[PDB]
Design a protein around this ligand. Structure first.
Ligand SMILES: *[C@@H]1O[C@H](CO)[C@@H](O[C@@H]2O[C@H](CO)[C@@H](O[C@@H]3O[C@H](CO)[C@@H](O)[C@H](O)[C@H]3NC(C)=O)[C@H](O)[C@H]2NC(C)=O)[C@H](O)[C@H]1NC(C)=O
Ligand SMILES: *[C@@H]1O[C@H](CO)[C@@H](O[C@@H]2O[C@H](CO)[C@@H](O[C@@H]3O[C@H](CO)[C@@H](O)[C@H](O)[C@H]3NC(C)=O)[C@H](O)[C@H]2NC(C)=O)[C@H](O)[C@H]1NC(C)=O
Ligand SMILES: *[C@@H]1O[C@H](CO)[C@@H](O[C@@H]2O[C@H](CO)[C@@H](O[C@@H]3O[C@H](CO)[C@@H](O)[C@H](O)[C@@H]3O)[C@H](O)[C@H]2NC(C)=O)[C@H](O)[C@H]1NC(C)=O
Ligand SMILES: *[C@@H]1O[C@H](CO)[C@@H](O[C@@H]2O[C@H](CO)[C@@H](O[C@@H]3O[C@H](CO)[C@@H](O)[C@H](O)[C@@H]3O)[C@H](O)[C@H]2NC(C)=O)[C@H](O)[C@H]1NC(C)=O
Ligand SMILES: *[C@@H]1O[C@H](CO)[C@@H](O[C@@H]2O[C@H](CO)[C@@H](O)[C@H](O)[C@H]2NC(C)=O)[C@H](O)[C@H]1NC(C)=O
Ligand SMILES: *[C@@H]1O[C@H](CO)[C@@H](O[C@@H]2O[C@H](CO)[C@@H](O)[C@H](O)[C@H]2NC(C)=O)[C@H](O)[C@H]1NC(C)=O
Ligand SMILES: *[C@@H]1O[C@H](CO)[C@@H](O)[C@H](O)[C@H]1NC(C)=O
Ligand SMILES: *[C@@H]1O[C@H](CO)[C@@H](O)[C@H](O)[C@H]1NC(C)=O
Ligand SMILES: *[C@@H]1O[C@H](CO)[C@@H](O)[C@H](O)[C@H]1NC(C)=O
Ligand SMILES: *[C@@H]1O[C@H](CO)[C@@H](O)[C@H](O)[C@H]1NC(C)=O
Ligand SMILES: *[C@@H]1O[C@H](CO)[C@@H](O)[C@H](O)[C@H]1NC(C)=O
Ligand SMILES: *[C@@H]1O[C@H](CO)[C@@H](O)[C@H](O)[C@H]1NC(C)=O
Lengths: 140, 601, 140, 601
């Protein structure tokens, strides 16, 4: 399994690898890197799906230092009139998008943080890919 | 290079299998051949000859540089082509020649340049034509569209179309019948000279995220004049740069069109007033807003003719004060801002959905709250805290009622459902309820589906509360921590067929409580811990029983109450899953199916 | 047990009797009689307590046509600065008070409605009296 | 006529026992003789002679017409007299003669007429003098009050005192030391000529429900001038007629006094603004409102010096916007109106109580919400719905925290108590909680009392969540529907002494999970259904165990696992209530104490 780095910050060391059999590439960038303290920034994505980016959503399996959390389910785009333009893509169509984010108001602690990322989309709802995120953390 | 056989000799998919030619060593009668991401740098005439029958064909990212003449020739019954992502630099004239029944045609990310030199002139039965993400410079419809009927969609989004002129769309003045659900979004356009759209008709028009300022948008709205679009959709996309100003005299001039259905679909601006804005968007029989933050505004009280409203994912600071003389349906779902509720006045309303908002009701539910008196549907599920101060009063006509995962307060202090004589559905599942009054379900005479899974019981003893509910065919009771049941509890219930009773904590099965159930077919006792019985007076269940799930609970494998295990080898005709019905009590007898161990004692 | 009537209305027939050993008199009036439909009116009370009307409260045992309800607990006066003047009384002191009431928004049904009334007050919290209310009901 | 002996030869009570004379056939050394509602139409000298010792004496409603001279003579150590409801038409001079140590003196509903011909002149040690519900016409203090020191209360309420003059209270200008918690309420008064109260001092002054209009109240407030009352209490009573007007220039002229503690205690008027009203009620170090409906008002933002506030039982329409530079305590309890919350700014606040309001928190708890940073106490219990979006941040100094019977949301999604390193108390009992994260109680290192009774568990299996909580001496776990417990769960817990584990659903007791608890003294397993064990490897509990409640659960009275019942006759030294530990499993062996039935097999 090859390791894919993303960015470093004062208290973050994001990276990720692949879960499943198929390993279709993807390009993710974040500027500036997330400070796991309340951050802001942009998220640039370059992708070419093998399915339709329609009714896309994420299953997140989070792990707080060898302690599982419950399972998270995030619906990115629903059906009609998405907030985003990239969820009108088709197979083979270039997605080249930018989404900004920000958060604040929570304290974390040290340890190997993990999150299994499962994207699901399409007509019969088959998976689009799995990714595995490793986020170390050590506040200053 | 094995092509996966998805449906036996019907559909094969060959994706990413590094091919260079069509796999004609494939069965002779194919349908729905997937062939994408296989490099085919060029096609030849009669390419798909060994496939005389073919319904769906996909060539996505197959990097087709040129489609030669006469290709696809020996290929009819072909309903779909997906030429997505193929950069076509030489599409030969007369291509797509022999295609008798072609309806869908997707050419996205293909390097198009205009529609007049586009070989579909001979086409018919062609309904969709999705030409998105292309390089097209002016919206001048070519003349062969005259011959081309049946065209219903024309989605040219993300194109480089800059502006429009008068005699553009000189076509469409010759169409007695024309349904064209046109969609022009993300086109950077800064001029619409007047009179261009005129005596024209559409069936949808989608312009989102294309005007860079308020003046551009204003005078281009002035450009469209007398359009008569049956459904308009404006807005923008959260994904890119957006307008930095939006107030009253924007959206003006929209007042010359003939709209019937409107939708503003996003707005990055914290709009702060709703009339003298959306002013000439009245008489539209369907209003809709999505994701637009109108946080601080007081005056929602205004008269519009709006036979359908929907406010999905909107933020506020207050519950809006709706006053609509004509509004039949509302969907205030998944909003986030203002977690309260105040009486609205919707005199003619027949549907209502306030779901997953999280708001709280102190005046609960009465005819005084929604101002109507014929509300057939109501969903307050997945909200915060609902306090019952009034049984549904003035709402005697209400066939649907959901509450699941809310927080019902004071539900035991009186007959809370006492007015609902016409009610078929009721879901009070997983509300924080403690049933301690034998008259909770009083008044529901037509209730046929009763769901309540996750509601406590006084001392964990099922009382006789299911009386006068004689139409109940479906009864849900699971995670109700029941340790005992009244021996006469499910009486007067002659129509119950499904009866869920699992995930409680029982320790004795018996058949007397179910001596008289003529219509029962399923009876679930799964996640209990049921070890023995009263005594082997356990009798045959009613004939109707066709299913008795007894799986997943503990058992006691010693000589005594081997008569109980004999009475569970009584029926092989009504058991369900003998695989997970096993032994628990001794250590030596572990994981053993019960009917399996033959012991004398 | 002697029956004590209070008032009739279109759909009410209030009355009451005594529970306990001691039967110290009391005078209760309501004008106009409660219509068990949403009503308004005044409640005139003439009493001479045998304890202090201090930290008074009620235990109500309600019975909806041979179906018990849970138990109700109503605190009339707490400690300092009561809403009412009569909860500053002492033993032997004449209480002669008037309290108005109103309610609306609930439907009831027919049947023998009962409510056991237990007043508690004083320094060691001993009972002041028990009363037993019978409220028939038959809407028009 | 048996006088009830309440405390053996100490206190006897003879109430309603129809007497006519003192029961001197009673023990010779009495204290606290109750004698009320017995008809004594007249008393005589040396009436209470056979009671040489007497602390408390009660004559309530004994209908004493006349108290003759010299009565009560042979009676000292008498600290209390209660002459309530006795209509005295001839109180002879020199009555109450021999009373060496008398402090309390209650003469209520006695038909008094004035205080100058009132025989208490010789009195001393007299602290209370409650003369309420009398017939007194003018507030002119008689001169013998000079000799009468130690008087601390003087409650003359409900009297017919009409107005006051200047040289009334010419006394009290000669008092170097005088504490007089005066209370004049329900006195219909319509004039206070100026200068009357002057250079005077009090320690409370209670005027509620006495002025019939706004002008009367205004100019009578003008009457009191330079009073210096240490605590003022105005208002009215819900019980009678009230003012019909209250706004800005009422309460004016109150600005000449020297108040320190204020209380308005009721108002039937829907007051609608709070400054330019209560305008010269600043610098009062304790503000308080009770039962006053101020529903619609926006401007609470104002500067006052208010070192204590309290808003009990008040109604609003909005959460008030408090901005107080100096306010150390707040009690916003049992309010009813506005069920929300918005950030207040109390820069110096050390106590906070928002209990039984029912309001809802969307911004939950952070230093951003209350504007302070040293909040030692916080009670949000019995509220509506509390959404955790922030672990307590900026509140690192918080020793008390209650949440019980609220509705906590998202409590499992992260370590919600991660900042509270100084926290002794925590009550999350009966919140709708599903513990499914092993790091819920992370951060609480000083927690010694953990109450959580009524919170579910993932699959009903107790995980190892009580780690790093080593000071926990008290642990509450009941109605948590636990069917299994991790064999290594209560480790690192060396200080736990009480350990509640009852009302779950167990079926096997064992001692390995409690092999190492050095400080346990109590261990409750009551409302389970515990029938057998793992195997008779059940070992001695730690020496410290002095109590093992095993009451109230089912048992199995057959030969096998008679070794289990032998192991519960193992200990007679640690059992608790052998009366309700009985038999359940056979029909013939019913209700039988277990250690009682001697069987071989
Ligand atoms: C033995 O226990 C089983 C559970 O432990 C019971 O299970 C079955 O559960 C299924 C839930 O997935 C039910 O399915 C659903 O079917 C209904 C039919 O109308 C659909 O609407 C729902 O959408 C669908 N849900 C999903 C997720 O598919 C099965 O119907 C149900 N089995 C039966 C017979 O109803 C078994 O029922 C129980 N054994 C017996 C004999 O009942
Ligand atoms: C056998 O089960 C009994 C319950 O079924 C346990 O009962 C006792 O419960 C009492 C509750 O009323 C506890 O009392 C309270 O005592 C505490 C002491 O600090 C006071 O604060 C509370 O105010 C008070 N509450 C009331 C209503 O009085 C008893 O303390 C408690 N018993 C013990 C020993 O703590 C028995 O505990 C259990 N058997 C054993 C040996 O624990
Ligand atoms: C009676 O009510 C219970 C209430 O839960 C119903 O239980 C549900 O049963 C289904 C069927 O087994 C469960 O699905 C199982 O889910 C797992 C994980 O998703 C899956 O791997 C299994 O193959 C199976 O589908 C489901 O978890 C369970 N609970 C819920 C909340 O749905 C039960 O079906 C009802 N009985 C009848 C006869 O209807
Ligand atoms: C462990 O926690 C449980 C949680 O309830 C504690 O239970 C309480 O125990 C007391 C003592 O028996 C119960 O009081 C009983 O109340 C009835 C009716 O009021 C009264 O008649 C009895 O004489 C007795 O006092 C009480 O109902 C019960 N429940 C609650 C909610 O208080 C238990 O005490 C705890 N164990 C230990 C050792 O602290
Ligand atoms: C980005 O962060 C990672 C992890 O914090 C850094 O990787 C570590 O690098 C240091 C410095 O060379 C080593 O001492 C550690 O052993 C490394 N640990 C792991 C787990 O990789 C990385 O160096 C950082 N990048 C930069 C540019 O500083
Ligand atoms: C007040 O109401 C009660 C009960 O509704 C009435 O008492 C009943 O009186 C009628 C008329 O005489 C009798 O037929 C019934 O048998 C009585 N029933 C009971 C239970 O007492 C009473 O008459 C009413 N008072 C008035 C003045 O109409
Ligand atoms: C995505 O679009 C931007 C728009 O300018 C462009 O600069 C960038 O090169 C594009 N990404 C790729 C991978 O081409
Ligand atoms: C197009 O318009 C025709 C007009 O008769 C209508 O029947 C048809 O449903 C429309 N198309 C779609 C996809 O609804
Ligand atoms: C349902 O209940 C109603 C009223 O009790 C009754 O008329 C009807 O026959 C029942 N059954 C059905 C199938 O509607
Ligand atoms: C109670 O007070 C009112 C006040 O006028 C009086 O009329 C009435 O007679 C009093 N009640 C009694 C029983 O005296
Ligand atoms: C009365 O005033 C004195 C002044 O020294 C004070 O000590 C005393 O506590 C006061 N009385 C009461 C009841 O507080
Ligand atoms: C409580 O915990 C603190 C910090 O973990 C520790 O210093 C202290 O000794 C413990 N015990 C007591 C009784 O405070």
């Amino acid at each position: 399994q090859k390791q894919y780095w993303v960015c470093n910050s004062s208290d973050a060391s994001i990276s990720y690898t692949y879960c499943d059999k198929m390993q279709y590439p993807i390009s993710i960038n974040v500027n500036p890197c997330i400070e796991l303290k309340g951050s802001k920034g942009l998220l640039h994505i370059f992708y070419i799906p093998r399915r339709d980016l329609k009714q896309l959503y994420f299953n997140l399996y989070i792990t707080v230092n060898t302690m599982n959390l419950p399972k998270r389910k995030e619906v990115i785009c629903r059906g009609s009139d998405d907030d985003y333009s990239f969820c009108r893509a088709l197979k083979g169509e270039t997605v080249n998008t930018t989404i900004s984010f920000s958060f604040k108001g929570i304290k974390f602690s040290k340890g190997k943080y993990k999150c299994v990322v499962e994207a699901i989309s399409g007509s019969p709802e088959e998976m689009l890919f799995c990714l595995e995120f490793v986020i170390l953390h050590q506040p200053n | 290079e094995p092509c996966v056989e998805v449906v036996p000799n019907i559909t094969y998919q060959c994706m990413e299998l590094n091919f260079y030619k069509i796999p004609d060593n494939l069965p002779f009668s194919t349908k729905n051949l997937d062939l994408s991401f296989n490099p085919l740098r060029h096609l030849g005439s009669y390419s798909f000859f060994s496939f005389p029958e073919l319904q769906v064909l996909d060539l996505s990212r197959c990097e087709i540089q040129t489609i030669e003449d006469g290709a696809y020739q020996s290929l009819s019954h072909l309903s779909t082509l997906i030429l997505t992502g193929n950069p076509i630099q030489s599409l030969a004239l007369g291509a797509f020649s022999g295609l008798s029944s072609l309806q869908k045609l997707v050419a996205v990310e293909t390097n198009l340049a205009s529609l007049e030199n586009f070989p579909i002139g001979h086409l018919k039965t062609l309904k969709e034509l999705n030409v998105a993400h292309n390089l097209i410079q002016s919206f001048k419809l070519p003349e062969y569209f005259s011959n081309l009927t049946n065209l219903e969609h024309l989605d040219l989004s993300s194109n480089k179309i800059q502006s429009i002129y008068c005699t553009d769309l000189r076509v469409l003045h010759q169409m007695p019948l024309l349904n064209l659900s046109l969609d022009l979004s993300l086109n950077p356009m800064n001029f619409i000279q007047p009179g261009a759209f005129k005596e024209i008709r559409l069936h949808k028009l989608t312009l989102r995220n294309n005007f860079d300022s308020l003046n551009v948008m204003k005078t281009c709205i002035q450009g469209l004049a007398g359009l008569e679009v049956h459904r308009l959709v404006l807005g923008e996309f959260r994904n890119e740069g957006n307008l930095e100003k939006f107030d009253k005299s924007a959206l003006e001039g929209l007042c010359n069109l003939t709209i019937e259905e409107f939708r503003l679909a996003y707005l990055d601006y914290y709009l702060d007033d709703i009339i003298d804005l959306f002013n000439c968007l009245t008489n539209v029989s369907s209003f809709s807003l999505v994701s637009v933050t109108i946080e601080r505004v007081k005056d929602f009280s205004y008269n519009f003719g709006w036979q359908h409203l929907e406010l999905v994912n909107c933020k506020f600071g207050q519950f809006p004060t709706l006053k609509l003389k004509s509004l039949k349906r509302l969907t205030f779902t998944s909003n986030k801002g203002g977690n309260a509720f105040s009486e609205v006045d919707l005199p003619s309303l027949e549907f209502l959905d306030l779901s997953r908002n999280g708001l709280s009701f102190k005046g609960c539910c009465s005819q005084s709250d929604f101002g109507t008196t014929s509300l057939k549907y109501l969903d307050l599920s997945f909200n915060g805290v609902i306090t019952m101060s009034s049984n549904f009063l003035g709402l005697e006509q209400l066939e649907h009622l959901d509450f699941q995962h809310s927080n019902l307060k004071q539900m035991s202090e009186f007959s809370v459902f006492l007015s609902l004589r016409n009610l078929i559905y009721l879901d009070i599942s997983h509300t924080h309820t403690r049933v301690a009054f034998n008259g909770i379900f009083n008044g529901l005479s037509s209730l046929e589906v009763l769901k309540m899974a996750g509601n406590s019981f006084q001392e964990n003893f099922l009382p006789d509360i299911f009386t006068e509910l004689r139409n109940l065919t479906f009864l849900d009771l699971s995670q109700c921590q029941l340790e005992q049941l009244s021996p006469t509890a499910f009486n007067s219930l002659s129509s119950l067929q499904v009866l869920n009773m699992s995930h409680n904590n029982f320790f004795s099965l018996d058949t007397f409580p179910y001596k008289c159930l003529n219509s029962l077919q399923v009876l679930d006792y799964s996640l209990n811990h049921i070890m023995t019985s009263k005594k082997q007076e356990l009798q045959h269940f009613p004939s109707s029983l066709a299913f008795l799930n007894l799986t997943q609970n503990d058992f006691a494998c010693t000589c005594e109450h081997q008569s109980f295990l004999q009475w569970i080898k009584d029926q092989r005709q009504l058991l369900v899953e003998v695989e997970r019905m096993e032994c628990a009590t001794p250590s030596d007898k572990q994981g053993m199916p019960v009917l399996s161990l033959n012991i004398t004692c």
